[PDB]
Amino acid sequence: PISPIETVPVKLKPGMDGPKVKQWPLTEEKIKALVEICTEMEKEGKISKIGPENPYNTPVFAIKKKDSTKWRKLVDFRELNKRTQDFWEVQLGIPHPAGLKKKKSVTVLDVGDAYFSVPLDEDFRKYTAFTIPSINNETIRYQYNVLPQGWKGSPAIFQSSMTKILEPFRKQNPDIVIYQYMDDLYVGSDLEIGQHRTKIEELRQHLLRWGLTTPDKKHQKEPPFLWMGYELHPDKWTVQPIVLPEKDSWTVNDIQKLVGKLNWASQIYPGIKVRQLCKLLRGTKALTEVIPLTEEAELELAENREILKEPVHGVYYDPSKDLIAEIQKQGQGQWTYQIYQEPFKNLKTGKYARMRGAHTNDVKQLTEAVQKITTESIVIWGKTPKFKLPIQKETWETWWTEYWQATWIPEWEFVNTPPLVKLWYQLEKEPIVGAETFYVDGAANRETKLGKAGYVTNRGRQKVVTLTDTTNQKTELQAIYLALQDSGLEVNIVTDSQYALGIIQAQPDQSESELVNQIIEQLIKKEKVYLAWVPAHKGIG
Amino acid sequence: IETVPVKLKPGMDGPKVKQWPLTEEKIKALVEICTEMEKEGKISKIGPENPYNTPVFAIKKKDSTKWRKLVDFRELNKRTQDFWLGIPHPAGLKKKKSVTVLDVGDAYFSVPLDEDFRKYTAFTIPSINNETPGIRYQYNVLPQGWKGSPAIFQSSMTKILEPFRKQNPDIVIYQYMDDLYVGSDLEIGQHRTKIEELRQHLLRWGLTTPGYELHPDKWTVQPIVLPEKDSWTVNDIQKLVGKLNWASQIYPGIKVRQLCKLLRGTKALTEVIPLTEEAELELAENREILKEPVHGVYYDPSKDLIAEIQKQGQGQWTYQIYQEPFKNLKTGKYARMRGAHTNDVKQLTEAVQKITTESIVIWGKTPKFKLPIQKETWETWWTEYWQATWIPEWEFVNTPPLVKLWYQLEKE
Ligand SMILES: CCOc1ccnc(CCNC(=S)Nc2ccc(Cl)cn2)c1F
């Protein structure tokens, strides 16, 4: 079963040479095993067997295919691979279900043993050698003339060869979609069964005309198909419902793993929670430890189980319809979105759980989901969806027309599906007339975590607290904090904190710092707030 | 013709840059463009033995409904041996009255590329939803967007133009990449004729070389204008001082004492304060200083040229070109073009382009950009609005709040 295709040129990484590892001794039952079998290899079509020339020994042990008990040879090129050049991305990524279209019939030919049908680069075969020591001394060596299991470039090249070989059939048949993954060949179409079946054989024969033997319709695979955790049908895909085990003794690694499989699901079944399981891990001593299980912990597991019951029915992509992407805020920083063309006929759905930094706001976050979704889409449909976002046009308009950073959102449309993302506050663009004016100021001795922070108003109000164990910014912000506290619904606040300026400025509504978060609360609670910044020491005070 | 031997700078290796996902619209376009290109023998499909890769995409040109193929050889260029044989930057077009740009990418295909280097020009046309593996190619000729291309074509270029350079030594012409800048002091009348004239002169040989004007005699830099009100409040004075105190980095002559004194006490911001005659004098001096650009600013070509941009809101945007902070060589403003009524990325992009364009003119050299935007957002859409055969270097940042309020105070 040798194919007549021009081998592709394979060079070993420059400045390096073929392996030199030693063959480790084997039982006598494994020797006579690899022996009586390798003799077939050359008998097949690949002239494999050499002598003292090309001393590139490669390990060749033997392990039985437990379920047959009959030694089928095997090798290890770990070294060779190391010494072989690099090829190009073999599968930059797998096709996601929501991007396939529906078909009348799909088949997959298990072109399994195809690697061995393709001719290896002759000038390279050389760098492939065996060593099957009988039993005693005598200090039985083969090579390769065809792509072998384990070699770095076997798949890469194979795919390509396949690619070339299919090009014609693909053209004479632009109504039949083929898909190559690993050693399988997915084929779909909207032909009437009988027609499909014949093209399939037509093709099956076409491959064989190249030396690629394939299975007859009597021994093939049939839908539904197992994908990325998706159960596939030619008309629909479904989420292979997976249920969590009922455990007597819960271990650390157990939770670690349970919580993982749990998170995966959350994308499909938004409603899943794990905050209370994420808590059984705090302080964990060893991976094999057995943690109790809070009641709040079981109420979650049990409540999650209810959810992961009824599976998920989904439909494929119709190029004819426009793409709709709708989002919702599960909570602070947690978003759920779902793409579809026919309402409720969900194509794809998801959840993003963004963290937090020295400054972020729901609006900005919203923005980040949109960009992700967009990209995701381009990748799957080559198009970007029309968005349905829970923000009011006025809200957006007034925000981005003020943010310091460049930002945009593709064609989108408001959807009053509370809770709506909104601006929790806005600093006044100028001093509020008829308002107290606090001149907050804070200082702390860098090395000795200790300082003071206070204020003084135009109404002659004053205050200063000493702070044991702190830094510069904590105090600054604190000063500000204070001002806000004992101040009233309308306050003007001068401060010289360079860092603080930006922070508050950018209307952040969530931070890492509990202190900053303090400030936010206050800021929200106020009627109107003007915040002003003035240069450092000497002058304004 | 033949082909001169090219190499990578020693030690370096071919770029292995990942292709970003493209929209369908673009994908089909490219596929169409590349098959045709293959037929002509300008490019060839390649195998996996080739591990290299560069990004490509398509952008429609201004006033054109035709998709143009664009590649990002930035990395490759970074790695190809500098040629030293370079291009001489004039200084005239800087001063000229009007300039026009010609796209001479086609000329580059005529000439072939060294066979041992072709491998490095590998690129990949992606498939939607990773349904099929990529369609990989590599150039056979001199590709567009490569630094070597104008270089290896330089000679041929000279003679091509000589008959015009000799017939009109009163007009300037600069070549940079697939671009060609030509400036004349002649009115847009006798000008267009001479450009469309020169245009033909080229079409002659065979290399299709097709608002669209420029005016370098209207941009160089602007002053920082200080407010000037009738009555000044505490806040007003404060802000004012903040700016100056910062400006004192560009002008050390700037004083801010007299003003700062008035600001002594714990007065309400809305409080109105009468200006000290001493203070009024001080301010007068600062106003005077700021009137013109700081002294001692020389363009050193030994060092890179930098470009910062501050979003100022209201479609407004500000920039400064410099090789050393606070010693800008030029600074300017840019008001969005009627179309980006709701698109920040569109604007930014446009901006970026003018600025680079200008650099070329002034110093014939692209600047590295400090863009106030997320890497994510930028890479998702910059391609959707780009329109230039070249691609400047860039990095994303956080606009320091001071610098903006500052240049915001630019001659309006
Ligand atoms: C099990 C899915 O295998 C495949 C993966 C990727 N691509 C193909 C061919 C393309 N087929 C298309 S557009 N639709 C499609 C729909 C349903 C099913 Cl079950 C398989 N393919 C496949 F057949």
PDB file of N, CA, C and O in Angstrom, chain A residues 214-258:
ATOM      1  N   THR A 214      -8.999   2.260   2.573  1.00  0.00           N
ATOM      2  CA  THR A 214     -10.004   2.802   3.488  1.00  0.00           C
ATOM      3  C   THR A 214     -11.084   1.756   3.783  1.00  0.00           C
ATOM      4  O   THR A 214     -11.216   0.774   3.054  1.00  0.00           O
ATOM      5  N   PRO A 215     -11.871   1.945   4.861  1.00  0.00           N
ATOM      6  CA  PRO A 215     -12.932   0.988   5.212  1.00  0.00           C
ATOM      7  C   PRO A 215     -14.185   1.031   4.319  1.00  0.00           C
ATOM      8  O   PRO A 215     -14.572   2.093   3.825  1.00  0.00           O
ATOM      9  N   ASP A 216     -14.815  -0.128   4.122  1.00  0.00           N
ATOM     10  CA  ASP A 216     -16.021  -0.221   3.294  1.00  0.00           C
ATOM     11  C   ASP A 216     -17.221   0.226   4.120  1.00  0.00           C
ATOM     12  O   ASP A 216     -17.179   0.181   5.351  1.00  0.00           O
ATOM     13  N   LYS A 217     -18.285   0.651   3.442  1.00  0.00           N
ATOM     14  CA  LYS A 217     -19.502   1.119   4.113  1.00  0.00           C
ATOM     15  C   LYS A 217     -20.000   0.157   5.190  1.00  0.00           C
ATOM     16  O   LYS A 217     -20.839   0.520   6.023  1.00  0.00           O
ATOM     17  N   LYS A 218     -19.482  -1.066   5.168  1.00  0.00           N
ATOM     18  CA  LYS A 218     -19.882  -2.078   6.135  1.00  0.00           C
ATOM     19  C   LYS A 218     -19.183  -1.900   7.481  1.00  0.00           C
ATOM     20  O   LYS A 218     -19.660  -2.395   8.497  1.00  0.00           O
ATOM     21  N   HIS A 219     -18.060  -1.188   7.491  1.00  0.00           N
ATOM     22  CA  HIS A 219     -17.335  -0.962   8.735  1.00  0.00           C
ATOM     23  C   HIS A 219     -16.925   0.507   8.912  1.00  0.00           C
ATOM     24  O   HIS A 219     -15.738   0.832   8.907  1.00  0.00           O
ATOM     25  N   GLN A 220     -17.913   1.388   9.081  1.00  0.00           N
ATOM     26  CA  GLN A 220     -17.657   2.823   9.258  1.00  0.00           C
ATOM     27  C   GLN A 220     -18.319   3.420  10.514  1.00  0.00           C
ATOM     28  O   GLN A 220     -18.984   2.711  11.278  1.00  0.00           O
ATOM     29  N   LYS A 221     -18.131   4.724  10.719  1.00  0.00           N
ATOM     30  CA  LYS A 221     -18.709   5.413  11.875  1.00  0.00           C
ATOM     31  C   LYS A 221     -19.965   6.198  11.498  1.00  0.00           C
ATOM     32  O   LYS A 221     -20.057   6.754  10.401  1.00  0.00           O
ATOM     33  N   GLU A 222     -20.920   6.261  12.422  1.00  0.00           N
ATOM     34  CA  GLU A 222     -22.189   6.932  12.161  1.00  0.00           C
ATOM     35  C   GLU A 222     -22.671   7.847  13.279  1.00  0.00           C
ATOM     36  O   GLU A 222     -22.550   7.519  14.455  1.00  0.00           O
ATOM     37  N   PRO A 223     -23.255   8.999  12.915  1.00  0.00           N
ATOM     38  CA  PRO A 223     -23.788  10.008  13.837  1.00  0.00           C
ATOM     39  C   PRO A 223     -24.699   9.370  14.865  1.00  0.00           C
ATOM     40  O   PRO A 223     -25.220   8.289  14.633  1.00  0.00           O
ATOM     41  N   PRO A 224     -24.892  10.021  16.020  1.00  0.00           N
ATOM     42  CA  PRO A 224     -24.330  11.315  16.423  1.00  0.00           C
ATOM     43  C   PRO A 224     -22.814  11.234  16.609  1.00  0.00           C
ATOM     44  O   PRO A 224     -22.279  10.159  16.888  1.00  0.00           O
ATOM     45  N   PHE A 225     -22.133  12.369  16.466  1.00  0.00           N
ATOM     46  CA  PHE A 225     -20.683  12.400  16.615  1.00  0.00           C
ATOM     47  C   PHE A 225     -20.197  13.145  17.852  1.00  0.00           C
ATOM     48  O   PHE A 225     -20.712  14.211  18.206  1.00  0.00           O
ATOM     49  N   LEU A 226     -19.182  12.557  18.485  1.00  0.00           N
ATOM     50  CA  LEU A 226     -18.537  13.063  19.702  1.00  0.00           C
ATOM     51  C   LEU A 226     -17.557  14.182  19.396  1.00  0.00           C
ATOM     52  O   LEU A 226     -16.501  13.943  18.809  1.00  0.00           O
ATOM     53  N   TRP A 227     -17.871  15.401  19.803  1.00  0.00           N
ATOM     54  CA  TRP A 227     -16.941  16.473  19.501  1.00  0.00           C
ATOM     55  C   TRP A 227     -16.384  17.081  20.759  1.00  0.00           C
ATOM     56  O   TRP A 227     -16.127  16.383  21.740  1.00  0.00           O
ATOM     57  N   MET A 228     -16.192  18.392  20.722  1.00  0.00           N
ATOM     58  CA  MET A 228     -15.673  19.108  21.870  1.00  0.00           C
ATOM     59  C   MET A 228     -16.758  19.049  22.940  1.00  0.00           C
ATOM     60  O   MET A 228     -17.430  20.039  23.213  1.00  0.00           O
ATOM     61  N   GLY A 229     -16.939  17.879  23.539  1.00  0.00           N
ATOM     62  CA  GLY A 229     -17.955  17.750  24.563  1.00  0.00           C
ATOM     63  C   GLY A 229     -19.330  17.966  23.973  1.00  0.00           C
ATOM     64  O   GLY A 229     -20.332  18.040  24.691  1.00  0.00           O
ATOM     65  N   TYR A 230     -19.380  18.087  22.652  1.00  0.00           N
ATOM     66  CA  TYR A 230     -20.651  18.264  21.982  1.00  0.00           C
ATOM     67  C   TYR A 230     -21.070  16.984  21.282  1.00  0.00           C
ATOM     68  O   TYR A 230     -20.239  16.243  20.736  1.00  0.00           O
ATOM     69  N   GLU A 231     -22.372  16.725  21.334  1.00  0.00           N
ATOM     70  CA  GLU A 231     -22.958  15.568  20.687  1.00  0.00           C
ATOM     71  C   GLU A 231     -23.507  16.163  19.405  1.00  0.00           C
ATOM     72  O   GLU A 231     -24.348  17.066  19.430  1.00  0.00           O
ATOM     73  N   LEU A 232     -23.010  15.661  18.285  1.00  0.00           N
ATOM     74  CA  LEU A 232     -23.406  16.179  16.994  1.00  0.00           C
ATOM     75  C   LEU A 232     -24.357  15.360  16.136  1.00  0.00           C
ATOM     76  O   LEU A 232     -24.255  14.137  16.048  1.00  0.00           O
ATOM     77  N   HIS A 233     -25.292  16.066  15.511  1.00  0.00           N
ATOM     78  CA  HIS A 233     -26.261  15.478  14.598  1.00  0.00           C
ATOM     79  C   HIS A 233     -26.215  16.358  13.364  1.00  0.00           C
ATOM     80  O   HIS A 233     -25.801  17.516  13.440  1.00  0.00           O
ATOM     81  N   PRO A 234     -26.632  15.822  12.207  1.00  0.00           N
ATOM     82  CA  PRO A 234     -26.634  16.568  10.941  1.00  0.00           C
ATOM     83  C   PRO A 234     -27.642  17.710  10.912  1.00  0.00           C
ATOM     84  O   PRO A 234     -27.673  18.500   9.965  1.00  0.00           O
ATOM     85  N   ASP A 235     -28.457  17.795  11.956  1.00  0.00           N
ATOM     86  CA  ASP A 235     -29.475  18.830  12.053  1.00  0.00           C
ATOM     87  C   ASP A 235     -29.327  19.616  13.347  1.00  0.00           C
ATOM     88  O   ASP A 235     -29.813  20.745  13.473  1.00  0.00           O
ATOM     89  N   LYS A 236     -28.639  19.022  14.312  1.00  0.00           N
ATOM     90  CA  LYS A 236     -28.492  19.673  15.596  1.00  0.00           C
ATOM     91  C   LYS A 236     -27.297  19.116  16.348  1.00  0.00           C
ATOM     92  O   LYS A 236     -26.756  18.074  15.989  1.00  0.00           O
ATOM     93  N   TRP A 237     -26.899  19.830  17.395  1.00  0.00           N
ATOM     94  CA  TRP A 237     -25.812  19.420  18.280  1.00  0.00           C
ATOM     95  C   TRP A 237     -26.406  19.514  19.674  1.00  0.00           C
ATOM     96  O   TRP A 237     -27.317  20.320  19.924  1.00  0.00           O
ATOM     97  N   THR A 238     -25.910  18.688  20.580  1.00  0.00           N
ATOM     98  CA  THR A 238     -26.398  18.735  21.941  1.00  0.00           C
ATOM     99  C   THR A 238     -25.237  18.594  22.883  1.00  0.00           C
ATOM    100  O   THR A 238     -24.225  17.970  22.562  1.00  0.00           O
ATOM    101  N   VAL A 239     -25.380  19.206  24.047  1.00  0.00           N
ATOM    102  CA  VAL A 239     -24.334  19.157  25.039  1.00  0.00           C
ATOM    103  C   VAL A 239     -24.430  17.847  25.795  1.00  0.00           C
ATOM    104  O   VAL A 239     -25.400  17.615  26.516  1.00  0.00           O
ATOM    105  N   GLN A 240     -23.430  16.990  25.607  1.00  0.00           N
ATOM    106  CA  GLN A 240     -23.391  15.703  26.290  1.00  0.00           C
ATOM    107  C   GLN A 240     -23.489  15.937  27.791  1.00  0.00           C
ATOM    108  O   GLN A 240     -22.471  16.116  28.467  1.00  0.00           O
ATOM    109  N   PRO A 241     -24.714  15.910  28.338  1.00  0.00           N
ATOM    110  CA  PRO A 241     -24.890  16.134  29.778  1.00  0.00           C
ATOM    111  C   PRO A 241     -23.970  15.275  30.635  1.00  0.00           C
ATOM    112  O   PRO A 241     -23.922  14.052  30.493  1.00  0.00           O
ATOM    113  N   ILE A 242     -23.224  15.928  31.514  1.00  0.00           N
ATOM    114  CA  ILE A 242     -22.315  15.222  32.395  1.00  0.00           C
ATOM    115  C   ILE A 242     -22.719  15.566  33.820  1.00  0.00           C
ATOM    116  O   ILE A 242     -22.911  16.737  34.154  1.00  0.00           O
ATOM    117  N   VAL A 243     -22.880  14.538  34.646  1.00  0.00           N
ATOM    118  CA  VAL A 243     -23.275  14.743  36.033  1.00  0.00           C
ATOM    119  C   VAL A 243     -22.164  14.393  37.016  1.00  0.00           C
ATOM    120  O   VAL A 243     -21.447  13.407  36.850  1.00  0.00           O
ATOM    121  N   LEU A 244     -22.048  15.228  38.040  1.00  0.00           N
ATOM    122  CA  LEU A 244     -21.041  15.106  39.083  1.00  0.00           C
ATOM    123  C   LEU A 244     -21.312  13.904  39.990  1.00  0.00           C
ATOM    124  O   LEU A 244     -22.461  13.633  40.334  1.00  0.00           O
ATOM    125  N   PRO A 245     -20.256  13.171  40.393  1.00  0.00           N
ATOM    126  CA  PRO A 245     -20.413  11.996  41.258  1.00  0.00           C
ATOM    127  C   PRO A 245     -20.870  12.335  42.672  1.00  0.00           C
ATOM    128  O   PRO A 245     -20.495  13.373  43.214  1.00  0.00           O
ATOM    129  N   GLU A 246     -21.689  11.464  43.258  1.00  0.00           N
ATOM    130  CA  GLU A 246     -22.165  11.670  44.625  1.00  0.00           C
ATOM    131  C   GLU A 246     -21.067  11.085  45.512  1.00  0.00           C
ATOM    132  O   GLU A 246     -20.901   9.867  45.586  1.00  0.00           O
ATOM    133  N   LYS A 247     -20.322  11.958  46.183  1.00  0.00           N
ATOM    134  CA  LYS A 247     -19.198  11.529  47.009  1.00  0.00           C
ATOM    135  C   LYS A 247     -19.420  11.418  48.508  1.00  0.00           C
ATOM    136  O   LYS A 247     -20.101  12.239  49.126  1.00  0.00           O
ATOM    137  N   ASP A 248     -18.803  10.390  49.082  1.00  0.00           N
ATOM    138  CA  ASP A 248     -18.863  10.124  50.511  1.00  0.00           C
ATOM    139  C   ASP A 248     -17.761  10.955  51.169  1.00  0.00           C
ATOM    140  O   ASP A 248     -18.011  11.715  52.110  1.00  0.00           O
ATOM    141  N   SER A 249     -16.546  10.808  50.641  1.00  0.00           N
ATOM    142  CA  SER A 249     -15.366  11.511  51.131  1.00  0.00           C
ATOM    143  C   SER A 249     -14.817  12.458  50.067  1.00  0.00           C
ATOM    144  O   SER A 249     -14.330  12.028  49.019  1.00  0.00           O
ATOM    145  N   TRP A 250     -14.879  13.750  50.352  1.00  0.00           N
ATOM    146  CA  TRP A 250     -14.405  14.765  49.425  1.00  0.00           C
ATOM    147  C   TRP A 250     -12.957  15.183  49.642  1.00  0.00           C
ATOM    148  O   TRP A 250     -12.628  15.761  50.676  1.00  0.00           O
ATOM    149  N   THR A 251     -12.090  14.910  48.672  1.00  0.00           N
ATOM    150  CA  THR A 251     -10.697  15.311  48.827  1.00  0.00           C
ATOM    151  C   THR A 251     -10.386  16.615  48.086  1.00  0.00           C
ATOM    152  O   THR A 251     -11.169  17.082  47.249  1.00  0.00           O
ATOM    153  N   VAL A 252      -9.237  17.196  48.420  1.00  0.00           N
ATOM    154  CA  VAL A 252      -8.765  18.444  47.827  1.00  0.00           C
ATOM    155  C   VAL A 252      -8.740  18.357  46.315  1.00  0.00           C
ATOM    156  O   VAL A 252      -9.467  19.062  45.620  1.00  0.00           O
ATOM    157  N   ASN A 253      -7.877  17.491  45.810  1.00  0.00           N
ATOM    158  CA  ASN A 253      -7.762  17.317  44.385  1.00  0.00           C
ATOM    159  C   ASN A 253      -9.151  17.055  43.807  1.00  0.00           C
ATOM    160  O   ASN A 253      -9.472  17.495  42.702  1.00  0.00           O
ATOM    161  N   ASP A 254      -9.975  16.345  44.570  1.00  0.00           N
ATOM    162  CA  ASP A 254     -11.327  16.032  44.138  1.00  0.00           C
ATOM    163  C   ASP A 254     -12.077  17.314  43.842  1.00  0.00           C
ATOM    164  O   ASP A 254     -12.650  17.471  42.765  1.00  0.00           O
ATOM    165  N   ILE A 255     -12.076  18.230  44.800  1.00  0.00           N
ATOM    166  CA  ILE A 255     -12.758  19.502  44.614  1.00  0.00           C
ATOM    167  C   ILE A 255     -12.101  20.267  43.470  1.00  0.00           C
ATOM    168  O   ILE A 255     -12.779  20.777  42.583  1.00  0.00           O
ATOM    169  N   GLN A 256     -10.774  20.344  43.499  1.00  0.00           N
ATOM    170  CA  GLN A 256     -10.022  21.037  42.461  1.00  0.00           C
ATOM    171  C   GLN A 256     -10.539  20.641  41.098  1.00  0.00           C
ATOM    172  O   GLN A 256     -10.759  21.486  40.223  1.00  0.00           O
ATOM    173  N   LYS A 257     -10.709  19.336  40.929  1.00  0.00           N
ATOM    174  CA  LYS A 257     -11.174  18.760  39.678  1.00  0.00           C
ATOM    175  C   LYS A 257     -12.670  18.964  39.468  1.00  0.00           C
ATOM    176  O   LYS A 257     -13.124  19.259  38.361  1.00  0.00           O
ATOM    177  N   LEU A 258     -13.438  18.790  40.532  1.00  0.00           N
ATOM    178  CA  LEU A 258     -14.866  18.979  40.433  1.00  0.00           C
ATOM    179  C   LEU A 258     -15.128  20.420  40.009  1.00  0.00           C
ATOM    180  O   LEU A 258     -15.883  20.678  39.071  1.00  0.00           O
TER     181      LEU A 258
END
